[PDB]
Ligand binder design. Sequence first.
Ligand SMILES: Nc1ncnc2c1ncn2[C@@H]1O[C@H](COP(=O)(O)OP(=O)(O)OP(=O)(O)O)[C@@H](O)[C@H]1O
Ligand SMILES: Nc1ncnc2c1ncn2[C@@H]1O[C@H](COP(=O)(O)OP(=O)(O)OP(=O)(O)O)[C@@H](O)[C@H]1O
Ligand SMILES: [K+]
Ligand SMILES: [K+]
Ligand SMILES: [Mg+2]
Ligand SMILES: [Mg+2]
Lengths: 617, 625
Amino acid sequence: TPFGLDLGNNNSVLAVARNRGIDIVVNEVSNRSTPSVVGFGPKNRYLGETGKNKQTSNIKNTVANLKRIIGLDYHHPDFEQESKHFTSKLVELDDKKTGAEVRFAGEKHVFSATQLAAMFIDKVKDTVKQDTKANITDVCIAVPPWYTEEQRYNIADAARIAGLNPVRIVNDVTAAGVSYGIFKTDLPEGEEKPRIVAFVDIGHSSYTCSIMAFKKGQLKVLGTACDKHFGGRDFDLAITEHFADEFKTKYKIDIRENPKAYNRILTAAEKLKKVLSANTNAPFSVESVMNDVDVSSQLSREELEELVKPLLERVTEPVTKALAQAKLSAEEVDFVEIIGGTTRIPTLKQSISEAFGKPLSTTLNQDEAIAKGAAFICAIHSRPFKFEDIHPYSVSYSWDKQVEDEDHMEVFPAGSSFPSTKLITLNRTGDFSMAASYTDITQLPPNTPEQIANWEITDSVPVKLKLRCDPSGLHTIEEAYTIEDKTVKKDDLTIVAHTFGLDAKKLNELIEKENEMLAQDKLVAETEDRKNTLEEYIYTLRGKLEEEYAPFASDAEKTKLQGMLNKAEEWLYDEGFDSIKAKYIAKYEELASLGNIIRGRYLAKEEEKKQAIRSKQ
Amino acid sequence: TPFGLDLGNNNSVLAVARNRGIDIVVNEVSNRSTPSVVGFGPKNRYLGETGKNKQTSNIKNTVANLKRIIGLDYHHPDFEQESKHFTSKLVELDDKKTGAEVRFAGEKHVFSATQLAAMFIDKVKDTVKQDTKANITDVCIAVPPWYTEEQRYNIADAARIAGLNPVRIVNDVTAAGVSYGIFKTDLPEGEEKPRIVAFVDIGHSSYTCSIMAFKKGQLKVLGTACDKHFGGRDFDLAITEHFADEFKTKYKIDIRENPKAYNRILTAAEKLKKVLSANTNAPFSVESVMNDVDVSSQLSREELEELVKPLLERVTEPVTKALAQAKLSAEEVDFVEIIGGTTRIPTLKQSISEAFGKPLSTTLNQDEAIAKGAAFICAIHSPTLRVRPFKFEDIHPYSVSYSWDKQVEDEDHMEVFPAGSSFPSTKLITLNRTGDFSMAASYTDITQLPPNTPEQIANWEITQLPEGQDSVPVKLKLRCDPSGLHTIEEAYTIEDIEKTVKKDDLTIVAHTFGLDAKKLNELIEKENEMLAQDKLVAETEDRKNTLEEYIYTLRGKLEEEYAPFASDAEKTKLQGMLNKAEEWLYDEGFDSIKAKYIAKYEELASLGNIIRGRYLAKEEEKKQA
Ligand SMILES: Nc1ncnc2c1ncn2[C@@H]1O[C@H](COP(=O)(O)OP(=O)(O)OP(=O)(O)O)[C@@H](O)[C@H]1O
Ligand SMILES: Nc1ncnc2c1ncn2[C@@H]1O[C@H](COP(=O)(O)OP(=O)(O)OP(=O)(O)O)[C@@H](O)[C@H]1O
Ligand SMILES: [K+]
Ligand SMILES: [K+]
Ligand SMILES: [Mg+2]
Ligand SMILES: [Mg+2]
């Protein structure tokens, strides 16, 4: 079953392609999104919903912002902008990336961002399995367009650790554009000019604007621009920093000194923010914030807009930047579509409508567009719809000079489209190395390494190579063979690839490690359920003996069972407090063996009553 | 429907007589008992289970120990023993009794003990009505045997405020004895020696021992003794005081300075106590007790037994005193039966088994016997259901005298119901009268009563024609009623004109601990106002939730099942109205009236039901084609 995943900073949305079309998959408490949280306990992990519920009580061992630390160099210049949203300890790894340090299973543990992502992916995979009752094998994962090539490899490997095959890592707004494309049945055709649609997605952490050209059965991305430091969490954080100051004066409590107090305010601040999307004033009240002090305040929409004024100075930058890339003026855009939870804020809606000079459209589902798009894309593997995403930076390939007059060439230019295949023929005097790099490093984000990937391969013998920018926008070499003199195939050379993607050895180590953790989670939950089943059976069976089952057992049988029930409870206090699954099942069955005999006699007179009613009619 | 109420200090149990038996009524979360708690909030009362849940949150406005403050003089010498279990403010009332001061509906309110008890009774009455779908009009309430005559009147009037006729106020252990009596099928008959059974009930606050004689269809109480300051709450308190001291040293937090912190430990201390009924060692762990400090300790059974040592010095006293009243040695009792939650404590079982010289029996259900006995007693009264009869006499421990105006009579004074007699009891007396006269009932020997007991129980005025012969003889019917209350039932002149011919029925004005019609009706009306406000708030919230949930599910269905059954135009008109409804809920629908939540829903459904109809029409074709 094809599986689409919108992995959000705040919540993830799951979609599957089945029957006619594409359904959202609900979680175990029937929610249409799952909090993107990973928590750790003394016995097991708290993944998703239960992770989020324990976020204040388990504060130091709860990891969120999972997609943000993926591929994050510990000395990235934006480290602290990411760091301030963490509640657990972040640490430097051997590879110079970022992990989390947690108390888990009575011990200190360090997990990498790739592992932590896999834990959550595995959780949502299990959620789709419990819903579909099917084997889940392939995933399409939607990511923000600002995701680096490295980050795209990392998240893909996280999928593989979760035991899933990542068929494509798609850009999120592009996945949503697909959902718009497969939905609309009035699109321009043939000679007609395309429909120009602008998409604005503002979520918990990211703000993206993407401009796309639409014809019937196809789309082309013309321009994409992102502000990765623009989203809901920045509004929540401004509110709580404001109240931190006010409560210090008002209540003589400093919530910055108590991580739990701070998180109680942060959590309430999100709710107050939403009230202000609808109302111009909102009260603010939280019980037992710190030292059992109840706080009471308020905030106006005007005051809120002032708190984020430095952030709001960049509100039109993504639209301006996207238009410029698209070579378009704001007049030339036909429709403007908004998605993401944060586009619900009035000041933001005012600004982007004013920037395009056009009213905002809500054709797409705010929360489900991206996930359903990815589920369609995943299904594409096995309604034809073509789409090409934009390739921002020019990428060159290089090789050993040798007998060839040149050693490098621009292969995929800036403003190009992906996926893209470019066929190259090279004269060779022996085995050779290759490498893909960015043509103009100045056009890339600060601190990007120039080299993308490299390869080893195997008067002059010609070789045809297939260079590809794949559907995920990653830079590969697909095949390598020799020519013989129109043309003939001679020999295939083995390619050894070195990319950001993990080697099989490391990948298998991390797969076996996630299997161990998952089996532990399963074992703990099933053990707890058998314990709970026994406890409830003791409780109800005692109550039935004092009622319905009373006429249906001798004094000798009742005292036997009653003593067994008392002994069962006694056991649950002692060796049954933290026992194994088989023992809870065994104690249950020995009670039920006698409990079912009585129920069998009960149900015998129950039939007799029904017969007595019928014989009187 | 006969209703029996076991009103516990910690929890209450409800029983009804129906079908061919007596059943326990479960509450709104399917629990077989209800927390005996009354809390107050900005819009409504939190009664029972919801009162208990908000107990730490709403600590200053949560009233428990309801049955302990009934009839409680603010200057009672045991006042502090009672008040240390209170989390809300206790105040003195105009009548010298005790009430509670709370914040309720945005204001400061003082409620009397009788009012507070009526709030709770009214809650459990609603619970019975929702289980039976009938109207409930009568109750039998089980009370501890140490309840004074005044307290019995107060709780009866609390039942009246709650709209119930209290048919009997029964001693709780007597009610459990009836349960035993109607359950056993092998009791002695005719001339055979009666079976002597001792009953021991230790609950949350009280410890009662009662010795009874049983024959088929009857019981007689032979002796009763109580310790009203001996119960589970005294174990919980000892544990939490122990930890209060420990945590000052270990964690540098003082839970006695923070009532919420204290209650967090008190609540966990009860769970630890129960662990120690089964195990000899127990770990103690509470998260965020105070200032977000987690605490982690342990306690042994031996350490617990040491903490309650001063309490355990008194552990054989109720059995010793009941046996002495019964005039029996311990070996003359045939069976010892235990009930009440706290009889689960190993040290207590050992001690009471040693005092009798007998293993303990658990014939009766530990938690349900009293409530069931009370429902049966309520059912013997009511002239609708006929059951197999069971007679019971309870013990009347104090001597009660009646007095009257001297007039032509030699004495003005007479013992009527002696110490160690039985109730109910009726005595006929003849009095020669020279005019309308006053009477009074009082305790014959006050030194035999609890300290500070007023000597007078009740008094009467009688308003009687001399019949021209200096002095007319009047016959009076004096009664100790089935609840143990002392009244004058009947008063009338007799004449020899025929010899046994009655002359005139006389008017009796009675002054009891019972409330007068005027005051009762005032409190009834108050309870009706509060109860109507509770129903309105609950209904309004339900209609709001129904609207909210409908917005949620209808939006989803337009994406999943209703897509083919609505046009582009139907979808966006409904989508918009859903949006407007959500906005309204943030603004004018935030705290609106019930009719507006209903109107908003109906507006959405008038559109939504059109679409559901079409979906439902095709769903039927599929179950065929
Ligand atoms: N009515 C509302 N008013 C204001 N903010 C809202 C509203 N509804 C949702 N939000 C905000 O939207 C954010 C969640 O939106 P969304 O699910 O689009 O983000 P995400 O996909 O988890 O994050 P990202 O895409 O940035 O990784 C939260 O910060 C939430 O508070
Ligand atoms: N296994 C146990 N071990 C120790 N104590 C227990 C156990 N089970 C229940 N209890 C205690 O028994 C008390 C409740 O008993 P019960 O229901 O008989 O009291 P009650 O009727 O509310 O109080 P009272 O009769 O004093 O007014 C509580 O203190 C509870 O903690
Ligand atoms: K999301
Ligand atoms: K009880
Ligand atoms: Mg998003
Ligand atoms: Mg009791």
